[PDB]
């Protein structure tokens, strides 16, 4: 239970993110930490990755959803690990709240540029609005390409290799 080994730092001045759903207020702050090229603390990052595993591993391998006649869904495609585009759509088409039940067709580690930060925010939003926010796997997405496009190196640069095992 590496999360309960403490070793907290808050060099980022980061709020504690609990095992309960991440507050929107921080998520807005996290988007600002991307406007400012700033990163999460490790115990919070480990704790969200644990929770993300626990929810995602139970979701059906084909996702089934009924869209009511009066309801509208915004559908999204390849992002190549740049958050700037989703930054804007969230701000433009409404933040990905229950009123913006987005579906994202994967391809986030498709390339590395802000890609850790991309999945790190998407995985934040997925905990707060799991019913509305839906993530698929992309087609450029396996260890084979996590290596070719240096995402494995981003992880190994920012964190010790066990972090890459958890992300896997």
Partner 1 sequence: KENYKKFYEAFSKNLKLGIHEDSTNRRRLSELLRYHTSQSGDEMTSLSEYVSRMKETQKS
Residues that bind partner 1 (CB under 8 A): 2, 5, 7, 159-163
Cα(19)–Cα(25) distance, integer angstroms: 16
The CB-of-160 to partner 1 minimum distance in angstroms stands at: 4
| Token pair for 50 | 């644990």
* Footprint of Mn ion on 75-94 (CB under 5 A): 78
User: Which residue intervals of 36-111 are DSSP H helices?
Assistant: 42-56, 84-92
Specify the residue, 39 or 111, whose C-beta has the smaller distance to partner 1: 39
Q: Among residues 93 and 162, whose Cβ is nearest to partner 1?
A: 162
* Mask for 99-128, x = binds Mn ion (CB under 5 A): --------x--x------------------
Sign of CA dihedral 79, 81, 85, 86: positive
The answer to whether residues 74 and 99 touch, using CB atoms and an 8 Å cutoff, is no
Partner whose footprint covers residue 160, from partner 1, Mn ion, none (CB < 5 to 8 Å by kind): partner 1
Question: Which of these ranges, 43-51, 94-102, 122-130, 139-147, lies near Mn ion under the rule CB under 5 A?
Answer: 139-147
Query: Which partner from the list Mn ion, partner 1, none does 10 bind, CB cut-off 5 to 8 Å by kind?
Result: none
Residue 134 DSSP one-character state: E
**Is residue 34 a contact partner of residue 114, using CB atoms and an 8 Å limit?**
yes
Question: Residue 49 or residue 159: which is nearer to partner 1 going by CB?
Answer: 159
Structure tokens given for 31: 């988007």
Is 140 near Mn ion (CB under 5 A)?
yes
Handedness of CA 111, 54, 165, 33 (dihedral sign): positive
Q: Which residue, judged by CB position, is nearest to Mn ion in the bound state?
A: 107
Question: CA 159: distance to chain centroid?
Answer: 17
CB of 110 to Mn ion, least distance (A): 4
> Between 41 and 132, whose beta carbon lies closer to partner 1?
41
| Backbone phi and psi for residue 36, each to the nearest 5 degrees, phi listed first | -115, 10
Question: Which residues of this chain interact with Mn ion, rule CB under 5 A?
Answer: 78, 107, 110, 138, 140
């Amino acid at each position: 239970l590496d999360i309960e080994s403490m070793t907290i730092e808050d060099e980022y001045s980061g709020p504690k993110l609990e095992d309960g759903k991440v507050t929107i207020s921080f998520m807005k702050e996290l988007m600002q930490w991307y406007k400012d090229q700033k990163k999460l603390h490790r115990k919070c990052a480990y704790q969200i990755l644990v929770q993300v595993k626990e929810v995602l591993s139970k979701l059906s391998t084909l996702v089934e959803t009924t869209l009511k006649e009066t309801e509208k869904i915004t559908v999204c495609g390849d992002t190549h690990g740049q958050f700037y585009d989703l930054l804007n759509i969230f701000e433009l088409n409404g933040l990905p709240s229950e009123t913006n039940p987005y579906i994202f067709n994967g391809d986030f580690v498709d390339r590395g540029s802000f890609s850790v930060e991309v999945i790190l925010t998407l995985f934040g939003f997925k905990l707060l609005y799991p019913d509305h926010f839906h993530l698929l796997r992309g087609n450029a997405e396996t260890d084979n390409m996590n290596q070719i496009y240096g995402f494995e190196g981003e992880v190994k640069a920012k964190y010790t290799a066990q972090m890459y095992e958890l992300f896997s």
